[PDB]
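Hey, weird one. I pasted the Protein N-terminal glutamine amidohydrolase sequence into the form twice and got a warning about non-standard characters only the second time. First submission, copied straight from the form history:
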Amino acid sequence: QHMEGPAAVHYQPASPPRDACVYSSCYSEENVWKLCEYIKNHDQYPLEECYAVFISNERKMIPIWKQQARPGDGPVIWDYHVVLLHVSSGGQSFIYDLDTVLPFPCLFDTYVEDAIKSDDDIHPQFRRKFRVICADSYLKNFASDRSHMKDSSGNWREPPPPYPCIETGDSKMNLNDFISMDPKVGWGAVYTLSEFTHRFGS
């Protein structure tokens, strides 16, 4: 036997159940934005405990396992993917990924072990980096006009979410500044996988 040695065994989710959340396939940046908006308006948790997490790399090709789009043991290769991180006040982190087949929410270490996996044996151009943006800053600064989701004739590659584009007073499109993992660009902090797990893991 091994003791763990605060443990959020009675943790109450910060969102409704998965199937009650606003969701559009291939718009995880907006799915996460809508979770942040829910948390802000629900007055259950401080918004400052929550983070939007962009996952990508220089070549924009990241594997993620346990994804609903490819049931089974293989990964989805995304250009980028976004999840919500809640660092609960006792220190235990939870990941909210509407696209995972893992629990919603999922303990941080379980998500990193099963959905992300180690980069040690991954071909280097597929290795993952993480941009972590406070949810308040994400709601204040993110904007997307969805122009990246159209084909060469201007028609939707994937059907858009059923509400108007997210925009701010300062921008109608800055998605590339969140997908970027250049720390000189955008908002938040950029981590390698080992830095990310060192920072938030138990």
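That's the output from the first submission. The warning seems to come from a hidden character in my clipboard, not from the data itself. The domain at 21-200 is CATH 3.10.620.10 (C8orf32 fold).
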